[PDB]
Amino acid sequence: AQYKVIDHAYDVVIIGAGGAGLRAAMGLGEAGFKTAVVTKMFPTRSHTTAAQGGINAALGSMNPDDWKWHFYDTAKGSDWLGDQNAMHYLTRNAVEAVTELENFGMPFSRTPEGKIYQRSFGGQSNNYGKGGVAKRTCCVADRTGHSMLHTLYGNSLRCHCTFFIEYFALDLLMDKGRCVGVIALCLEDGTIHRFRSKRTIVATGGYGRAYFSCTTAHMNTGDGTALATRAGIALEDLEFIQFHPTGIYGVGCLITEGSRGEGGFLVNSEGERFMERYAPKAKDLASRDVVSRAETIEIMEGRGVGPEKDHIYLQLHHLPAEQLHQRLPGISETAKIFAGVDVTKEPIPVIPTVHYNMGGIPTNYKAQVIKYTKEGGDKIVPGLYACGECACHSVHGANRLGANSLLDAVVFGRACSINIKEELKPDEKIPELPEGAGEESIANLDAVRYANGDVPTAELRLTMQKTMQKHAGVFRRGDILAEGVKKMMDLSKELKRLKTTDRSLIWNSDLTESLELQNLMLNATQTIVAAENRKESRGAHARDDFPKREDEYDYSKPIEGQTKRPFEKHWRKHTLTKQDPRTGHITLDYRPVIDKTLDPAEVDWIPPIIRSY
Amino acid sequence: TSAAVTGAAPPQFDPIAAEKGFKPLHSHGTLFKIERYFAAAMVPLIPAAYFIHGREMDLCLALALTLHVHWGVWGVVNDYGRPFVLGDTLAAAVRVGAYIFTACLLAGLLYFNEHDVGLTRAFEMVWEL
Amino acid sequence: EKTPIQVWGWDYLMRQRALKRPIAPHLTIYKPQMTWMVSGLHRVTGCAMAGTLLIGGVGFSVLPLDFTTFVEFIRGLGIPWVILDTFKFIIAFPIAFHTLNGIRFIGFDMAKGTDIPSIYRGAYLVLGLAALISLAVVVYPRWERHKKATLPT
Amino acid sequence: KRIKTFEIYRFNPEEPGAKPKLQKFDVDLDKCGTMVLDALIKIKNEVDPTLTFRRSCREGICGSCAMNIAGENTLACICNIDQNTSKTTKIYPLPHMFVIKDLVPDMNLFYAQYASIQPWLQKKTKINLGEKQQYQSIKEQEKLDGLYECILCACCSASCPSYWWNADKYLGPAVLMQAYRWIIDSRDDSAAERLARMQDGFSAFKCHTIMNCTKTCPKHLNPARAIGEIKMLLTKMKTKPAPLPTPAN
Ligand SMILES: *Cc1cc2c(cc1C)nc1c(=O)[nH]c(=O)nc-1n2C[C@H](O)[C@H](O)[C@H](O)COP(=O)(O)OP(=O)(O)OC[C@H]1O[C@@H](n2cnc3c(N)ncnc32)[C@H](O)[C@@H]1O
Ligand code: HEM
Ligand SMILES: CC(C)Oc1cccc(NC(=O)c2ccccc2C(F)(F)F)c1
Ligand code: SF4
Ligand code: F3S
Ligand code: FES
């Protein structure tokens, strides 16, 4: 078939228009850079808009607080797979970057002294663990995410961006390991577009649709990390999928951890406030790995609830009806719509569901995409940048801390623009395009457009979701994994036999979902083989066959004269899957975890310990 | 493929620049206030006309009515009579109509007040049969 | 002349007329409901009354046969008293309702009573209230006319 | 079993000067989900994948799937499928929009208008950004309730027969409520030329106070109230000043 192709040149091009999408689009537009923001849906529709319990900063609006305590909660929360330095930049710039958002127009809920309302959340504490449960989570009550994306989008309208609304990012454009831009199908008229740009930013969100039951949006098909895999990058830490504790039993749409830090709790079949046993101190407000686990143990050890005894209860009815309205209005409501549940009088049916993807496109604290060989450290892919869910600076490690995600979005968004001003120097002109670049991205589009196999696209997505659901869930076994891996590769195979019906370009819904189906498969497979190989339990990745966390030392005993296990023998290292996209072979490799802060004088590094809550 | 033409930006509205030239001061605020208040003050009138009669009532009843209707049709005419449907120069025509209308309505009433039964009485002179 | 957005907006129409997309269905398919019906009826009665006032004001003026002899060009036909206060009702109402509804809309213009119950009662309070003052103004003066043609003690 | 029958607007712009049609689709409701979007997703993933409609969030918070179901404008993702299988639930796109294809309308005029209100906090005396939070009383932050929640979905505007007739000049309820969302923000210094902007005959004042906007909002908001409240400002009710930032802020 015949195709129209189009060319623009920009200083920087952004794939993604969500939280990090825009916050960087803000800095760069304002810095007077010719900016194009390519997004595959009107930016409001983006997933950030769906966020709830708030965004963390040590604002001190409920009690004195120190950004350093927040730091500590982040290192711990990450079960030390977190990059000490990357986590630093996040924790340090928090109070500013949240503050900034207020200045921007964000109608935060308010304290009687006219300050930003903060609220407790999963797995935070005052004074480096010692003190009580912390209150750092600033929020627009129950729909923080909604308000963040909406301010950002607004405030981005005064920063001179060229918005490319509903355009589908096919592939990055390469030239000798340097990203010179991006290629997308225009949804509206059906053209194809090439953007030559000096830098390119990937902030595409996560891939929570690789599982069967999740809290992610239908557009969370993990397309960026697909481009990254396709561009010959390894991805990082894919095996760490974070299971949110409280997802509505039926559909699985989120009920905030807010409901917990606000004073609510989980309950089993007996009536027991069970979290007390699985964690004595921080209880219903332990990290979301510990808790989602606890639930699944309670479920499987009989004490489940309802008709099939297969989920637990989130009980909020014991809480003052006033504060329940003025602090949780949307969940209060989506509970009535979906569970058909009155929150003031009954509990919500909840079950851990696939939520956030710590894993993604690897970077340094400067938010630049890296390829790591063992011989010559991490070398930077020229002029490629990533942030938000889809990146892995690993600030989250093995377990993203509740509400460090919109912080991570905005902070490293901001960071992109700050860091690109300092390094792109405008002597360097807009790159030329390699003889017919991404003529193959346009090819793979023709093949899927007129796809004619025996297996529909609908049908492939379902089993891939289901197999992921069984073989990669909360608790996993060396064989039950190996067993998924096989079923999994069998699908990347089944991809040739793909079947679509719609032959159009003008808003081909079908065609684009099939492109997505491609992109997920890349994520999925990788996830499961990365998981299949990690023989330790850490953060959100728990093997029944290796319950232990496999560090250098055993951090249960003094350490004085213990021989440091070599890099090849322990598990404190980032998984790093390198997938060949046409066969779908995946080789592994393991990058060391960064343990130095940004400046050891400002804050001293935090050494590992036995992770209890 | 390698046959591509160079593309322009998407039509997009520029909240800053394309909103720092144009600024013209003329408020329809002030004026809307008055058309509401009149329509309001026009309440007692309709009751009162059911009782008190004569040339005097006839007068202000059919003088105010002219105005209320003048504004009203304007509103209407302005709504439907839209250029995207009638082409620029027909839309201009109907807008003139709304005043031509408003003129004959007056003339018509003012005659009928001075020369036929009058208004107020022309209702008595029905409400009995 | 036009706010910049209005300039841009026109350009849009032309651009969409350019691409000959069809305009999505709107009135033939929108669920009949009280909100827009009462708004309908308001405009309807409005115009109709102005209509009459023009074609009646101007009508009788630039026409030979005046209004008094109209009142006769009717009664002398054999006019059933039943249908005669069907006619007088058809007239009282559009005045009674437009006035009543009118005061209501001024409520809305100044933000008073826009919650769905006030929206929906207003409509019922104003409709029935029209028919009451419309009925008891046609049938009330037919008590100083059909009581004084029969009456007992 | 339970066959529900849906009747759906269909349009192919690629079909060589085709026309609109409705097309009946049959759906077993026990092999299906509970909300209209489910039934769309289903009858595109099982019957006819050339059915095209926007969606994303699956809990009615993105705004994507707004269309006209059963006569009124709402969110496919959060209105319940009508289980009376004898009746026939009929689905159209946002009324009076230009239809790119199928249940997809062109939204761009509505996005333009939104960005014309300049929907960002603008301050009189420019401040240093990251420096400190601005003071706002809890009771004056509450003035934004029923205002901020708008998902910018365009159900209201596309029900408003005035936005129908004059969307090019008339701003419509959605944008309007949001223009207001910013004027009463106690933190906002532009209140004055914010009204100054929609000072004319159409942009604001072609609201004929009809009430599909308040009555149709899937988020149970009320733009009529805020359009009304704007009127008040274009005249005779002035906006309250910012209560004074107390000391220690
Ligand atoms: C799912 C979820 C997540 C969540 C949450 C509640 C829910 C239900 N609540 C949170 C909370 O209370 N606090 C917090 O810190 N985090 C919370 N989260 C997680 C967080 O919201 C997300 O991780 C965050 O939104 C990440 O931001 P990001 O910008 O990286 O992700 P996004 O907002 O989805 O961005 C999506 C954009 O990417 C574009 N995209 C993707 N693929 C393409 C292609 N191929 N072409 C063009 N554009 C693409 C989308 O179009 C969109 O613009
Ligand atoms: C106290 C008595 C009256 C009140 C309170 C009143 C009020 C109103 C109001 C508020 C509107 C504007 C609707 C809008 O633009 O939102 C209107 C419109 C109109 N009025 Fe009246 N009115 C009264 C009497 C009359 C009478 C007796 C007539 C007939 C001669 C009339 C004819 C019209 C017409 C033709 C419109 C057109 C505007 C539209 O339909 O939206 N009015 N009236
Ligand atoms: C089916 C419903 C929702 O749609 C109907 C269709 C026909 C036109 C109208 N109603 C108006 O046209 C109307 C009525 C009174 C005042 C102003 C208007 C105006 F301005 F033009 F919007 C409503
Ligand atoms: S107020 Fe409601 S109906 Fe209107 S645009 Fe916002 S969400 Fe949609
Ligand atoms: S329906 Fe239209 S008239 Fe105003 S009240 Fe809503 S925008
Ligand atoms: S799909 Fe999220 S709004 Fe309906």
DSSP letter string over A240-294? --EEEEEEETTT--B--SHHHHTT-EEE-SS---THHHH-SSSGGGS-HHHHHHH
* Tokens 């490293």 -> residue: A412
Q: Alpha-carbon torsion A181, A182, A183, A185, what sign?
A: negative
Are the beta carbons of D57 and A217 separated by less than 8 Å? yes
Residues in chain D: 249
Asked if CATH classification 3.30.70.270 holds for the domain at D107-249, the reply, yes or no, is: no
Question: Active site residue: A23, A260, A288, A543, which one?
Answer: A288
CA-CA distances (angstroms) from residue D242 to A109, A173, D187, D235, D249? 17, 51, 7, 20, 15
**β-strand pairing of D104-105 with D21-28:** unpaired
**What whole-number distance in Å separates Cα of residue A524 and Cα of residue A472?**
10
Q: Which atom of ligand 3 is nearest to C30's Cα?
A: 1
Alpha-helical segments (H) within D54-190: 108-116, 138-141, 161-166, 173-183
D213 is in an annotated binding site: yes
**CA D223 – CA A472 distance, rounded (Å):** 46
Instruction: Tell me whether residue B80 is annotated as binding.
Output: yes
D37: nearest Cα among D20, D54, D62, D12: D54
* C36 SS3 class: helix
Contact C13 D168 (CB under 8 A): yes
Amino acid at A30: E
- Topology of B1-129 in CATH? 3 helical TM bundles of succinate and fumarate reductases (1.20.1300)
A287-A290-A292 Cα angle (round to 5) = 100
Query: How many CB atoms are located within 10 Å of the residue D209 CB?
Result: 20
Contacts of D230 in chain B (CB under 8 A): none
Please tell me the residue having the least CA distance from ligand 2 atom 7. C102
**Cα dist from B10 to A167, B18, B41, whole Å:** 12, 16, 51
Q: Which other chains touch chain C, taking contact as 3+ CB pairs less than 8 Å apart?
A: B, D
Q: Which of A239, A195, A147 is nearest to A39 (CA)?
A: A195
Phi, then psi, of A172 in degrees rounded to 5 = -65, 160
Percent composition of chain A: helix, strand, coil (DSSP 3-state, to 5): 35, 20, 45
Under 8 Å between Cβ of A330 and A322? no
* Dist CA A612 CA A457 (whole Å): 44
In chain A, whose CA is at the least distance from the CA of D115? Answer: A157
For residue D12, with 0-12 CB atoms within 10 Å meaning exposed, 13-18 middle and 19 or more buried, which class applies? middle
Residues A417 and A31: beta-carbon distance below 8 Å: yes
Backbone φ and ψ for D92, nearest 5 degrees, come out as -120, 165
With vertex at residue D99, the alpha carbon angle to CA D95 and CA D101, rounded to the nearest 5 degrees, is 130
**After which residues does chain D have a break in its backbone, defined as C to next N over 2.5 Å?**
none
Q: Where are the alpha helices (DSSP H) in A78-127?
A: 84-104
Residues A324 and A43: their CA atoms lie apart, in Å, by 30
Tokens standing for residue B38: 């009149």
The residue assigned the tokens 């600076």 is: A393
CA distance D79 to A102: 34
Q: To one decimal place, what's the resolution in Å?
A: 3.0
Angle between helices A509-533 and A441-449 (to 10 degrees): 110
**How is A321-382 classified by DSSP, letter by letter?**
HHHHHHH-HHHHHHHHHHT---TTTS-EEEEEEEEE---BEEB-TT-EEEEE-STT-EEEEE
Q: Which residues contact B37 (CB under 8 A, 6 or more apart)?
A: none
- CA A143 – CA A136 distance, rounded (Å): 16
- In the block, which residue shows the tokens 């991205």? A441
Provide the CATH topology of domain A248-351: Flavocytochrome C3; Chain A, domain 1 (3.90.700)
Where does chain D have alpha helices with state H? 36-45, 108-116, 138-141, 161-166, 173-183, 191-197, 212-216, 223-231
CA D214 centroid distance within chain = 11
Copy the structure tokens of residue C30. Answer: 């929108």
CATH number of A432-548: 1.20.58.100
Domains in chain C, CATH or no CATH each: 1-153 (1.20.1300.10)
Residue of A nearest to D144 (CA): A107
The CA distances from residue B46 to B41, B58, B128, C96, C98, in Å, are 10, 12, 19, 9, 11
SS3 assignment, position A193: strand
Q: Residue B129: its chain C contacts at CB < 8 A?
A: 71, 74-75, 79, 84
A192: phi then psi, degrees, rounded to nearest 5: -120, 145
- Domain residue spans in chain D? 1-106, 107-249
Which of A528, A533, A537, A546 shows the shortest CA–CA distance to A590?
Answer: A533
SS3 sequence of A503-536: CCCCCCHHHHHHHHHHHHHHHHHHHHHHHHHCCC
Q: Which residues of B touch A5 (CB under 8 A)?
A: 1, 3-4
What CA–CA distance (Å, rounded) separates A353 from A214? 5
d(CA D238, CA D166): 28
Q: Which tokens belong to A38?
A: 């390519």
Relative to the CA of D173, which ligand 5 atom is closest?
7
Place of tokens 């009162």: B48
Which residues does A479 contact at the CB level (< 8 Å), separation at least 6? Answer: none
- C54, B101: Cβ pair inside 8 Å? yes
∠D59-D61-D67 over CA atoms, to 5°? 85
- Nearest C-alpha neighbor of A216 from the set A360, A55, A388, A47: A47
Residue with tokens 């779908």, as numbered in its chain: A584
Going by C-alpha positions, the residue among A189, A243, A175 that lies closest to residue A211 is: A243
From residue C68, alpha-carbon distances to A485, C100, C141, C145 in Å are: 98, 31, 21, 21
Query: What b/e readout covers A119-148, taking b as 16+ CB neighbours within 10 angstroms?
Result: bbbbbbbbeeeeeeebbbbbbbbbbbbbbb
DSSP D145: T
Strand partners for A301: none
Structure tokens at A183: 């290629």
- Pairwise CA distance, residues A154 & D73, whole Å: 25
Cβ atoms of residues A151 and A49 within 8 Å: no
> Residue A10 in 3-state DSSP?
strand
Q: Whose CA is nearest to atom 2 of ligand 6?
A: D57
> What is the number of the ligand 5 atom nearest to the C-alpha of D176?
7
Q: Residue A3: which residues within 8 A CB-CB, separation 6 or more?
A: A192, A442, A446, B1
Q: Which CATH number fits domain A1-247+352-431: 3.50.30.60, 1.10.274.10, 3.40.50.970, 3.50.50.60?
A: 3.50.50.60
> How far is A347 from D101, CA to CA, in rounded Å?
43
Secondary structure of chain B: what % helix, strand, coil (to 5)?
Answer: 70, 0, 25
Question: Residue written as tokens 């905030």?
Answer: A256
Please return the burial class of B118, using the count of CB atoms within 10 Å of its CB with bins 0-12, 13-18 and 19+.
buried
Classify domain A549-613 at the CATH superfamily level.
succinate dehydrogenase protein domain (4.10.80.40)
What residues does each domain of chain B span? Answer: 1-129
DSSP B120: H
Residue for token digits 């000043």? D241
Report d(CA A387, CA A447) in Å as an integer: 31
Total Cβ atoms within 10 A of residue D30: 6
Pairing mode, strands D21-28 and D3-10: antiparallel
Rounded Cα distance between A449 and A443, Å, is: 10
Rounded distance between C-alpha atoms, residue A533 and residue A472, angstroms? 12
Alpha-carbon gap, residue A251 to D111, rounded angstroms: 31
* Domain ranges (residues) in chain A: 1-247+352-431, 248-351, 432-548, 549-613
Q: Both tokens of residue B98?
A: 């709304």
Q: Is B24 exposed, middle or buried (0-12, 13-18, 19+ CB in 10 A)?
A: exposed
**b/e per residue, A496-532, with b = 16+ CB within 10 A?**
eebbbebebbbbbbbbbbbbbbbbbbbbbbbbbbbbb
Residue B40 CA to residue B68 CA, distance in Å, equals 11
Q: How many CA atoms lie within 13 A of D81 on its CB side?
A: 25
Q: Are D109 and D168 in contact (CB under 8 A)?
A: yes
Within 8 A of A163 by CB-CB distance, chain B residues are 10, 12
Q: Which residues in C have their CB inside 8 Å of a CB on D? A: 2-6, 8-10, 12-13, 16, 19, 21-27, 29-33, 35-36, 39, 43, 105, 108-112, 114-116, 119
Chain-centroid distance of CA A100 in Å reads 23
Q: Is A230 marked active-site?
A: no
Contact B124, C72 (CB under 8 A): no
Nearest to A5 among B3, B9, B15 (CB): B3
Q: Is A477 annotated as a binding residue?
A: no
- The residue among A609, A586, A605 whose CA lies nearest residue A597 is A605
Whole-number Å distance between alpha carbons of C130 and C94: 8
B-D Cβ pairs (cutoff 8 Å, strict): 43
d(CA D163, CA A30): 34
- Judge whether B92 is closer than 8 Å to chain C, CB to CB: no
The amino acid occupying position C26 is H
Instruction: Please check whether residue D118 is in contact with residue B17, taking contact to mean a CB–CB distance below 8 angstroms.
Output: no
Other CB atoms within a 10 A radius of the CB of residue C86 amount to 11
D59 bridge partner residues: none
**Which of A488, A410, A363 lies closest to A102 in space, CA to CA?**
A410
Q: With residue B23 as reference, give the H or E element that holds it.
A: none
CB contact under 8 A, D97 and C23: yes
Distance C148 CA to ligand 5 centre (A): 51
Burial (CB < 10 A; 0-12, 13-18, 19+), residue A589, is middle
Distance from residue D60's CA to the centre of ligand 6 (Å): 4
Residue D215 token pair: 């009555």
Interhelix angle B119-127/C68-75, nearest 10 degrees = 10
Q: What's chain B's length in residues?
A: 129
What is the SS3 assignment for B104?
helix
Between chain C and chain D, the number of residue pairs with CB atoms below 8 A apart is: 128
> Is the CB of A242 inside a 6 Å radius of any atom of ligand 1?
no
DSSP A136: -
d(CA A580, CA D143): 55
Cα A132 from Cα A398, distance rounded (Å): 24
Identify whether the C-beta of residue A134 lies closer than 8 Å to the C-beta of residue A69.
Answer: yes
- Nearest beta carbon to residue D134 from set A49, A50, A103: A103
Cα dihedral value D156, D160, D164, D170, nearest 10:
-90
Give DSSP secondary structure letters for C75-143.
HTTT--HHHHHHHTHHHHHHHHHHHHHHHHHHHHHTTTT-SHHHHHHHHHHHHHHHHHHHHTTTTSTTS
| CATH architecture for residues D1-106 | Roll (3.10)
Q: For residues D158 and D97, is the Cβ–Cβ distance under 8 A?
A: yes
